């Protein structure tokens, strides 16, 4: 299962973690992935597992790479076709700014009522049951419906979309990577030549009547972009929510603190975002480069994971403790340098209206009996279940 190790990485920097299933994983994922911060560790290190990589394990260092474009480039972003996601600088800013038209900060600020809508009606089906599993209940119905709301989709669309997203990421067997996109794109191009030629205020409209480099974008660009407005909001909010939720069902004080201090839900979605992170992408080297005494050879790939900057000690005092009064947050969970996160603010308002609503209309509610709480690892990580369970006595109707 391990690589030969490369003749160019000297033996002391080895440290076989594999990203997919790290040995500390029943403690908790965020926990398992901080065993790269143990003293002994080096800040950069060699990984036999996965075809064999680096690993930058401080923020300082995963920061300063995702700076450094010309060095390392997102041409190969995962170990071992979606636009922006695959481009460097200088093409990247056009589609990243055509992108940001669609899912920036006055669109988020437009339907914040409408998620809050949405968020409600969730809620209040599952209110009176006294239970639900908040994966499948909440989080992963809570995403798609925001997608339909920005792209001017229709509800009935909805089941057969998430099945193609699902494939992308939880293969049942049924299509390939390859045909789950294409099937996805089958379903885009007409909607995006229609709205060609009669033009909605919805994000496919937009970016399907949208200029790159002097001309129109075309079909393929218009597809590959509205893909990666879906899926980019999906797997990493669904996860997302599910970490925190978890988190709060077994802090009945942390609970109380949002309720009592609602004021304090922005700094406590922020607090959240840093202890939670859940994200690992990579790059691939340019060039042989020589980065903080390590040589490090052109086409070299490094995770550079955005969940480790919050959790290093070095950023953040006592980091895997939540307190919602910290000054400095300091975490880059929706990335850093040229490809941050395009829906942060999108994000942010998902998390910050769903703790308010949940909040809302039940305050208490606790892990179901008996369970425990399994979580996962890759390139998002996350959970696999959360079963919860309230006393529909002490909810209310709103
Ligand atoms: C908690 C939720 C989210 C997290 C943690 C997150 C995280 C990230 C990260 C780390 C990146 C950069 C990856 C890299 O540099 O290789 C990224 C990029 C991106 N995200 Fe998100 N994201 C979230 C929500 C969303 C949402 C809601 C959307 C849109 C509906 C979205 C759309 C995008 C897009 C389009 C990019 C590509 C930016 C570019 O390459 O220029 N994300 N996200």
Redesign the pocket.
Known sequence: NLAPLPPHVPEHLVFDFDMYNPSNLSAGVQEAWAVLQESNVPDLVWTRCNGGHWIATRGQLIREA?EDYRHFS?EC?FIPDFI??SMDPPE?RQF?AL?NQV?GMPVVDKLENRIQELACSLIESLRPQGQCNFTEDYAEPF?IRIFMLLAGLPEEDIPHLKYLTDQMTRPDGSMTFAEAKEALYDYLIPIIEQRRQKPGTDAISIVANGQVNGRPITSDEAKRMCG??LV??LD??VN?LSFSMEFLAKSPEHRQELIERPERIPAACEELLRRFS??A?GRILTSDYEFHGVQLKKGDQILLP?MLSGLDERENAAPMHVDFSRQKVSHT???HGS??????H??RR?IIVTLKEWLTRIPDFSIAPGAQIQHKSGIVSGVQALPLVWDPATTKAV
């Open positions: 995702y997102s972003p922006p996601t990247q990243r992108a899912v995403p990666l407005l980019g909001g990493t909010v997302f859940l994200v992408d955005q969970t929706f990335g490809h941050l996160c395009l829906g942060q999108l994000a998902e």
